[PDB]
Amino acid sequence: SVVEYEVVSKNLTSKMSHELLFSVKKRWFVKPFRHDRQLGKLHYKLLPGNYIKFGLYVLKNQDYARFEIAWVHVDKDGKIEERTVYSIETYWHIFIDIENDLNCPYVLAKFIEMRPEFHKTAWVEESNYSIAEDDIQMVESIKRYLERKI
Ligand code: NI
Ligand code: NI
C-alpha cells in the first residue's frame, strides 16, 4: 500500500528550488527512490503516515531565500493533502551561513547542507540515524531559531 509523490530539486544558474521529505516516524530524511536531473525533480515512494516537506526557494541575484515547512498527510486510499505550517523570507547569504552556525537546529543545518549541486538534484543517504526531538519540538526549535537569527 504505497504512494508516489513529487518534490522539486533544481539548482539553475538563476534560481534554486530544493524540497526534501523528512519522515515523522523515522525522525530523519527519506530516501528518494528516483532522482530526476533532466527536469529537476525527486521521486518518493511513501508508506501511509505523516512526513514533512522542507522547502528552500532561492533567487540568487536578488539575494532572496524563502523557507517553508509543509505538512504532508497520506491516508489509506493513497490520498494526499498538503498545508504549509510555516513560511519565512530572508536574504540567501544569511541562509547559507546557517550551515556554519555551531549551535542551531541540526536537521536545519543538515537540510541547507543537502541543497542540490548545479544542474542537479540533491540526494538522501541510506541513513539509520534519528534525532532526539519529535516532529513538534523539531519544527518549533527551527521556528524559534530562525526567529532569533532574524
Ligand atoms: Ni487521515
Ligand atoms: Ni509554532
PDB file of C-alpha atoms in Angstrom, residues 71-125:
ATOM      1  CA  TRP A  71       2.807  19.026   6.384  1.00  0.00           C
ATOM      2  CA  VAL A  72       2.279  16.043   4.191  1.00  0.00           C
ATOM      3  CA  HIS A  73      -0.601  13.735   5.069  1.00  0.00           C
ATOM      4  CA  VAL A  74      -1.016  10.347   3.410  1.00  0.00           C
ATOM      5  CA  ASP A  75      -4.049   8.202   4.317  1.00  0.00           C
ATOM      6  CA  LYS A  76      -5.077   4.690   3.306  1.00  0.00           C
ATOM      7  CA  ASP A  77      -6.740   5.253  -0.067  1.00  0.00           C
ATOM      8  CA  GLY A  78      -3.356   6.591  -1.153  1.00  0.00           C
ATOM      9  CA  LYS A  79      -4.767  10.101  -0.933  1.00  0.00           C
ATOM     10  CA  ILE A  80      -2.572  13.172  -0.365  1.00  0.00           C
ATOM     11  CA  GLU A  81      -3.270  16.536   1.285  1.00  0.00           C
ATOM     12  CA  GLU A  82      -0.829  19.453   1.980  1.00  0.00           C
ATOM     13  CA  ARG A  83      -0.770  22.623   4.102  1.00  0.00           C
ATOM     14  CA  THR A  84       2.056  24.983   4.799  1.00  0.00           C
ATOM     15  CA  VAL A  85       2.618  25.320   8.547  1.00  0.00           C
ATOM     16  CA  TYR A  86       5.475  27.870   8.338  1.00  0.00           C
ATOM     17  CA  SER A  87       6.980  30.143   5.707  1.00  0.00           C
ATOM     18  CA  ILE A  88       9.733  32.829   6.040  1.00  0.00           C
ATOM     19  CA  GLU A  89      11.518  35.193   3.653  1.00  0.00           C
ATOM     20  CA  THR A  90      15.089  36.297   4.079  1.00  0.00           C
ATOM     21  CA  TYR A  91      18.385  37.006   2.369  1.00  0.00           C
ATOM     22  CA  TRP A  92      20.196  33.958   0.939  1.00  0.00           C
ATOM     23  CA  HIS A  93      23.709  34.802   2.226  1.00  0.00           C
ATOM     24  CA  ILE A  94      22.193  34.561   5.715  1.00  0.00           C
ATOM     25  CA  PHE A  95      20.600  31.220   4.938  1.00  0.00           C
ATOM     26  CA  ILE A  96      23.828  29.725   3.577  1.00  0.00           C
ATOM     27  CA  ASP A  97      25.704  30.908   6.686  1.00  0.00           C
ATOM     28  CA  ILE A  98      23.235  28.939   8.884  1.00  0.00           C
ATOM     29  CA  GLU A  99      25.177  25.791   7.897  1.00  0.00           C
ATOM     30  CA  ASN A 100      28.164  27.062   9.892  1.00  0.00           C
ATOM     31  CA  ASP A 101      26.067  28.093  12.913  1.00  0.00           C
ATOM     32  CA  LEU A 102      27.600  25.937  15.596  1.00  0.00           C
ATOM     33  CA  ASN A 103      24.544  25.875  17.905  1.00  0.00           C
ATOM     34  CA  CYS A 104      21.458  25.709  15.749  1.00  0.00           C
ATOM     35  CA  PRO A 105      18.912  23.012  14.886  1.00  0.00           C
ATOM     36  CA  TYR A 106      20.709  20.095  13.316  1.00  0.00           C
ATOM     37  CA  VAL A 107      18.080  18.929  10.758  1.00  0.00           C
ATOM     38  CA  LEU A 108      18.018  22.586   9.620  1.00  0.00           C
ATOM     39  CA  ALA A 109      21.784  22.607   9.442  1.00  0.00           C
ATOM     40  CA  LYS A 110      21.598  19.255   7.574  1.00  0.00           C
ATOM     41  CA  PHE A 111      18.870  20.447   5.181  1.00  0.00           C
ATOM     42  CA  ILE A 112      20.668  23.541   3.901  1.00  0.00           C
ATOM     43  CA  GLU A 113      23.795  21.447   3.545  1.00  0.00           C
ATOM     44  CA  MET A 114      21.985  18.865   1.385  1.00  0.00           C
ATOM     45  CA  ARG A 115      20.936  21.525  -1.252  1.00  0.00           C
ATOM     46  CA  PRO A 116      21.410  20.258  -4.864  1.00  0.00           C
ATOM     47  CA  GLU A 117      24.642  20.791  -6.880  1.00  0.00           C
ATOM     48  CA  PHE A 118      24.495  22.772 -10.145  1.00  0.00           C
ATOM     49  CA  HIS A 119      22.025  21.468 -12.794  1.00  0.00           C
ATOM     50  CA  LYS A 120      21.253  18.577 -10.490  1.00  0.00           C
ATOM     51  CA  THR A 121      19.033  17.031  -7.889  1.00  0.00           C
ATOM     52  CA  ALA A 122      20.067  16.541  -4.286  1.00  0.00           C
ATOM     53  CA  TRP A 123      20.033  13.050  -2.828  1.00  0.00           C
ATOM     54  CA  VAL A 124      19.358  11.421   0.530  1.00  0.00           C
ATOM     55  CA  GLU A 125      21.774   8.924   2.148  1.00  0.00           C
TER      56      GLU A 125
END
